[PDB]
Amino acid sequence: MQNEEGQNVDLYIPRKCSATNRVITSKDHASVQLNVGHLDDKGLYIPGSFTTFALCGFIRAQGDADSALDRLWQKKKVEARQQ
Amino acid sequence: VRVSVLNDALKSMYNAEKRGKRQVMIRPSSKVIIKFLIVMQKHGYIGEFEYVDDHRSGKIVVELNGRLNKCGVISPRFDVGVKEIEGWTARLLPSRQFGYIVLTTSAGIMDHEEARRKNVGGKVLGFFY
Amino acid sequence: GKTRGMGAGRKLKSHRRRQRWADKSYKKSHLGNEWKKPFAGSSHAKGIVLEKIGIEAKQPNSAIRKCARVQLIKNGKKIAAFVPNDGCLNYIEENDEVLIAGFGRKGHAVGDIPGVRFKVVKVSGVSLLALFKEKKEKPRS
Amino acid sequence: KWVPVTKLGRLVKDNKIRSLEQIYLHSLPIKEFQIIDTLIGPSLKDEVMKIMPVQKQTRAGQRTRFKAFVVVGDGNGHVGLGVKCSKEVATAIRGAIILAKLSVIPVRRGYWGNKIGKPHTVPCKVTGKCGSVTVRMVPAPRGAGIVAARVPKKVLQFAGIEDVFTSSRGSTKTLGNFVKATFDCLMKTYGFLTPDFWKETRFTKSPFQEYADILSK
Amino acid sequence: TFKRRNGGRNKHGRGHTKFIRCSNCGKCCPKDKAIKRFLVRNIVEQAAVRDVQEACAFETYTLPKLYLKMQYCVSCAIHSKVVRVRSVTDRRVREPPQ
Amino acid sequence: GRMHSRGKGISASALPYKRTPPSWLKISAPDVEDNICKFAKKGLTPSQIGVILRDSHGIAQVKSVTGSKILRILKAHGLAPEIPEDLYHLIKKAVAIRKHLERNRKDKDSKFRLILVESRIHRLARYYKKTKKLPPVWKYESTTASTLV
RNA sequence: CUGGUAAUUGGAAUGAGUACAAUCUAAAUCCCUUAACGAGGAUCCAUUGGAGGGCAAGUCUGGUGCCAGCAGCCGCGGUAAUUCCAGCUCCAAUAGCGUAAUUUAAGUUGUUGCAGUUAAAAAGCUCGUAGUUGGACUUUGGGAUGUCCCGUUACUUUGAAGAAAUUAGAGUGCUCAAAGCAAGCCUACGCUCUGUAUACAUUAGCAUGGGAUAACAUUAUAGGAU
RNA sequence: GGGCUCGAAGACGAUCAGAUACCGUCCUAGUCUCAACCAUAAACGAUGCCGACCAGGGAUCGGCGGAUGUUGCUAGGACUCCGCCGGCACCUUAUGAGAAAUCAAAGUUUUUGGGUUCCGGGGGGAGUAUGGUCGCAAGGCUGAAACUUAAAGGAAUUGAC
RNA sequence: UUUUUUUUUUUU
Ligand SMILES: [K+]
Ligand SMILES: [K+]
Ligand SMILES: [K+]
Ligand SMILES: [K+]
Numbered sequence A: 001m002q003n004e005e006g007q008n009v010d011l012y013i014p015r016k017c018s019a020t021n022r023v024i025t026s027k028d029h030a031s032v033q034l035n036v037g038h039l040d041d042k043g044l045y046i047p048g049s050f051t052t053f054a055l056c057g058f059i060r061a062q063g064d065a066d067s068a069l070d071r072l073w074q075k076k077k078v079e080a081r082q083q
Numbered sequence B: 001v002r003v004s005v006l007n008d009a010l011k012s013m014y015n016a017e018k019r020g021k022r023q024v025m026i027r028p029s030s031k032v033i034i035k036f037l038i039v040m041q042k043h044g045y046i047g048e049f050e051y052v053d054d055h056r057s058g059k060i061v062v063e064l065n066g067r068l069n070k071c072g073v074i075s076p077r078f079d080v081g082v083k084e085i086e087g088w089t090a091r092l093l094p095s096r097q098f099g100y101i102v103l104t105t106s107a108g109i110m111d112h113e114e115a116r117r118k119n120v121g122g123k124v125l126g127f128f129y
Numbered sequence C: 001g002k003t004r005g006m007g008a009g010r011k012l013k014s015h016r017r018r019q020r021w022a023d024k025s026y027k028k029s030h031l032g033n034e035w036k037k038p039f040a041g042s043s044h045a046k047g048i049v050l051e052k053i054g055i056e057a058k059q060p061n062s063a064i065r066k067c068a069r070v071q072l073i074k075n076g077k078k079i080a081a082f083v084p085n086d087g088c089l090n091y092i093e094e095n096d097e098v099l100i101a102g103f104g105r106k107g108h109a110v111g112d113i114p115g116v117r118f119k120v121v122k123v124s125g126v127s128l129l130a131l132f133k134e135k136k137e138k139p140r141s
Numbered sequence D: 001k002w003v004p005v006t007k008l009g010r011l012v013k014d015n016k017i018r019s020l021e022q023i024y025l026h027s028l029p030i031k032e033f034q035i036i037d038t039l040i041g042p043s044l045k046d047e048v049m050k051i052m053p054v055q056k057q058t059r060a061g062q063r064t065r066f067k068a069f070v071v072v073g074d075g076n077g078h079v080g081l082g083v084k085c086s087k088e089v090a091t092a093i094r095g096a097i098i099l100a101k102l103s104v105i106p107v108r109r110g111y112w113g114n115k116i117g118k119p120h121t122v123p124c125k126v127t128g129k130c131g132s133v134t135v136r137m138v139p140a141p142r143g144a145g146i147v148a149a150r151v152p153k154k155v156l157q158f159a160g161i162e163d164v165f166t167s168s169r170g171s172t173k174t175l176g177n178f179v180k181a182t183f184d185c186l187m188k189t190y191g192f193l194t195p196d197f198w199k200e201t202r203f204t205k206s207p208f209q210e211y212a213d214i215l216s217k
Numbered sequence E: 001t002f003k004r005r006n007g008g009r010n011k012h013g014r015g016h017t018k019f020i021r022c023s024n025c026g027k028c029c030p031k032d033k034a035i036k037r038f039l040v041r042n043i044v045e046q047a048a049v050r051d052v053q054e055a056c057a058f059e060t061y062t063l064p065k066l067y068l069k070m071q072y073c074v075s076c077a078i079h080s081k082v083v084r085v086r087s088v089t090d091r092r093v094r095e096p097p098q
Numbered sequence F: 001g002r003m004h005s006r007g008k009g010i011s012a013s014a015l016p017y018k019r020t021p022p023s024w025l026k027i028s029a030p031d032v033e034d035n036i037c038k039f040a041k042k043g044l045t046p047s048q049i050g051v052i053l054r055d056s057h058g059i060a061q062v063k064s065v066t067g068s069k070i071l072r073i074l075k076a077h078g079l080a081p082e083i084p085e086d087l088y089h090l091i092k093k094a095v096a097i098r099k100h101l102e103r104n105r106k107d108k109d110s111k112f113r114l115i116l117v118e119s120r121i122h123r124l125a126r127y128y129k130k131t132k133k134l135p136p137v138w139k140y141e142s143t144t145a146s147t148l149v
Numbered sequence G: 001c002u003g004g005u006a007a008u009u010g011g012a013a014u015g016a017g018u019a020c021a022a023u024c025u026a027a028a029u030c031c032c033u034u035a036a037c038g039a040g041g042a043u044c045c046a047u048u049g050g051a052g053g054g055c056a057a058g059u060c061u062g063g064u065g066c067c068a069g070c071a072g073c074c075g076c077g078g079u080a081a082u083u084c085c086a087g088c089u090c091c092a093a094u095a096g097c098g099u100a101a102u103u104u105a106a107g108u109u110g111u112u113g114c115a116g117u118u119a120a121a122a123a124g125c126u127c128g129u130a131g132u133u134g135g136a137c138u139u140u141g142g143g144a145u146g147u148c149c150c151g152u153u154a155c156u157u158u159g160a161a162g163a164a165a166u167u168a169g170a171g172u173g174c175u176c177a178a179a180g181c182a183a184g185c186c187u188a189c190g191c192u193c194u195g196u197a198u199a200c201a202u203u204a205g206c207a208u209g210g211g212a213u214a215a216c217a218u219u220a221u222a223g224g225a226u
Numbered sequence H: 001g002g003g004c005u006c007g008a009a010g011a012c013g014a015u016c017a018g019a020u021a022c023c024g025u026c027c028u029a030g031u032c033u034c035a036a037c038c039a040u041a042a043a044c045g046a047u048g049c050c051g052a053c054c055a056g057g058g059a060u061c062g063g064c065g066g067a068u069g070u071u072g073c074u075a076g077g078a079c080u081c082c083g084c085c086g087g088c089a090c091c092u093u094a095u096g097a098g099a100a101a102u103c104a105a106a107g108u109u110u111u112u113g114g115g116u117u118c119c120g121g122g123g124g125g126a127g128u129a130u131g132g133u134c135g136c137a138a139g140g141c142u143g144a145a146a147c148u149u150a151a152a153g154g155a156a157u158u159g160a161c
Numbered sequence I: 001u002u003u004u005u006u007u008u009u010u011u012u
């Protein structure tokens, strides 16, 4: 949200679920954030480089977090040349 | 029996979006349904949808962005003049900054903002946001 | 569920009209029974004192509530009227002329007094409040 | 003085975390009220809303305890609610103040129409429900004021909302449920996905990951 | 308040079930509701088995068995202790006792 | 669901997406019409004709080869019955039920079923009167229903 | 220096009243104006309801003792009464305030917008005429540039017309205000053509553009179109 | 017409302070059937019907498709496995609802609108009075008011019993 | 499975 002038007005921008697109609220203590490390040509972890995924409590309580994260990681690894 | 195919389509999309599904199925298809979906897609509330031919009313598969809070039908289709749009939006939409009411006017099926722009009235079909 | 047909306005209107009678307030003001009641739809009524009566207070209280039996002049109906304030029954006599008002709950008993819906406002053209405060004096005749 | 027992408390005491928005972003639980006192303590105000006695029947009579309802807020988008039951009124009030501090949440404020100046009302239509009590907030134009009962009005004032329309259904004379429904309605402000939030989220390191080395000792 | 999902009986997709007579008091009770027990015991009690066997008039003989189906009303079943009052969670268990 | 019961069965035919005749079929449209007319002359209803064609002559759908429905072909040749086949069968069922009830006064189930069947007959007859498949004077009467068939 | 209190002191101010006079007025009266009078306990003396909670205000003092009484409701009173009868003090409004059909609150009549398992509630079951409701399908696109190419109704847009008064609303110092439709410059033997706008108005009727969504009627024994 | 059994009413025997009862004994009407009435039940899932969507799982009834190996049997039937449709239900779960108890429909409801019927509006008076209508009768259906009253009532918690 | 009836009004 912005003013007519163009100033940012919101207190903060909440994160969104990587799978459901839902807004992750401040009291959502079932939500998690995961970093998947990247590997070089020799299968060694490159420090500081990873793909970040966030899951809201709703999807994790449903048990669908595993498959959603698997699909998201597969797509992101295909895009990022991590194989 | 089936009375409003548009209601069934919108309710299926709403339930699927709440469940988090990436795709939903609409059966039977209709040109009113297609126009509603095109209005929704114009504003980024849905992805690509595909019509399936079966030598019958048809079928539609809709991609869901995850941006749809709620889409609904209004029944019966009340008469809405150009001056009643403000009241209808106040009744139905969460805010004046976003959200759309779909009307069927003699100029075609369109959202309420376009109806205000063209100064055309008609009948209310539904809403989405 | 409700009827929603665009051509079903008549049914909705008729259903509301029929269901309004289940409302007690609506039925009271639309049955035309207020004219058969002692006041006949008036805020006040004059009457003649027939007899002083003591009414026992309801549980858990214990008292003798002083009331008067009054016959309304305009229709001859007999009612019980409470006489408020300490010792104000001494200002009432048989065959006296009294102005009667409602007890404040629109035809229902108030407090621990059973079956009394009226109170005395004036006696012999002088308000009971003035008599209680000695502002005025009850006419001798 | 204060000896933090949590990673968040250690970071807040070490000045690594300086704004409540940093904690709100990652949805981290807050289990020490000293965190809130350090972050937004100076601007916070408290108010006891109700002292409610409750009784438990026992073999030798009724054991009475008192329920304290406390509301805290900075009047600038932060508000918290606290409920505590104790034998003594003072102990209950202290516990309620602590709990209200621990439960402070961010409140999103938007514009009714034209977006000039600071936000003045709720961004959208929101509804809260506790027990049978349902509280609905509707955006209102500038100058409309807070159209609400005294309990919701106080809760909204502590949240910094300038004008809003409200409606309530159910047993609003149940003060606890009324205030809890108002609080739930206010919390739901930041959960509604609007078109202005359609932008892709760009994640940032969590405080436990950003300051992992410091917390490693 | 409703305390049993089945309403204390075993009727589903059915209008009426004919009743039985309680084997103890003779009270009428729907068959699907009556507490039914099947008792299979030796005619000769274990105490008298040896004495009866010693007096057998044949080289070999297997003692018969007594078969009885008992159908109780709820009151008699509780009073006779065929069934007992259980806790709210324990009365949802349907398996027979081990 | 069912009109006069609580059944919710969904068993039905599944017409293929292909509307053209199969390649192996070689019969011609006029030939198919000739066989249909012959069967109708022999006293077969359109449903029976279609069943026979499908089961014996390899004609899955008459419309695929002829381009028109069986009843349309029969009408074009002046062979359609005076009353439609489904209404005829409903009336036949009603007549049978009434004949059975004549000797069974205690059979209240048969009375219930007769009420249902006659309601169906009347609704169908009203529809056929609306579409001018029956004369406006047509009326179903239980007393002389047996004459109609 | 800054504030609050005092039937302590001190002089100032003034209208309620009174009254020449003028003014007002058809004639009177009132108002406005104004000679002479008119305030210290400024006796030129403010009342109506309350003080447990809802709901602002006393665990003060005396009397009564489930009596008398209060109390819209919950409750007070049985010998230590914040609740009655009184004194003092305090609170609310204030030249006003108390008491005895109708609106809101009432989403407790629910079209927007209520309920029907156990709170009040779905007919024992099915059929069924009025009523209400009723699946899909018939011309889309580009090129260009509002324009060119390939039966009856509902509904909506626009226009006319649709008494004033009342409502909303523009202007205007009746000393202000409720009002009213006045009025303003300058003292010119006058002027501002002074102003006395504008909006709103269910349904139904009249005229007009649109042809999405709907309703009724029609279709093939060709007796069809040309 | 039947009338075995049981058994309103009734009669006795007990128990009891009494016992017009509970317990025992004998029994009329009834209980059964036919013809004609009656139309009410906690007639209950205390939960209208049609249609759409909506989690998982194992059982089971009917039909059907496929696979496979046996049968003291006559391609079939019985059994085994995998599926589809329809049905009576059950178990787990909340991302749902609810005042909760609970409910996979009592969900998709202040983010309120698929179609349609019935029906409630604090507690009593009262399912009463009156009128009408049906019934041989018993009674059924339709169905008020005067007046009275601050609670009655639902779910759940602790204690006491 | 013999028999077991009753506890003035208000208030704590
Ligand atoms: K008493
Ligand atoms: K008392
Ligand atoms: K039950
Ligand atoms: K049982």
Ligand SMILES: [K+]
Pocket: F001, F002, F003, F004, F005, F006
């Ligand atoms: K049916």
Ligand SMILES: [K+]
Pocket: F011, F012
């Ligand atoms: K079938």
Ligand SMILES: [K+]
Pocket: G055
């Ligand atoms: K008060």
Ligand SMILES: [K+]
Pocket: G079
């Ligand atoms: K004394």
Ligand SMILES: [K+]
Pocket: none
């Ligand atoms: K005293």
Ligand SMILES: [K+]
Pocket: G052, G083
């Ligand atoms: K008081």
Ligand SMILES: [K+]
Pocket: H003
């Ligand atoms: K007999």
Ligand SMILES: [K+]
Pocket: H007, H027
């Ligand atoms: K007997």
Ligand SMILES: [K+]
Pocket: H016
């Ligand atoms: K006894």
Ligand SMILES: [K+]
Pocket: H038, H039, H040
């Ligand atoms: K009967």
Ligand SMILES: [K+]
Pocket: E007, H044
């Ligand atoms: K039941």
Ligand SMILES: [K+]
Pocket: none
């Ligand atoms: K099954």
Ligand SMILES: [K+]
Pocket: C060, C061, C062, G066, I010
């Ligand atoms: K008392």
Ligand SMILES: [Mg+2]
Pocket: E001
């Ligand atoms: Mg119980």
Ligand SMILES: [Mg+2]
Pocket: E015, E016
């Ligand atoms: Mg039954």
Ligand SMILES: [Mg+2]
Pocket: F003
């Ligand atoms: Mg039907």
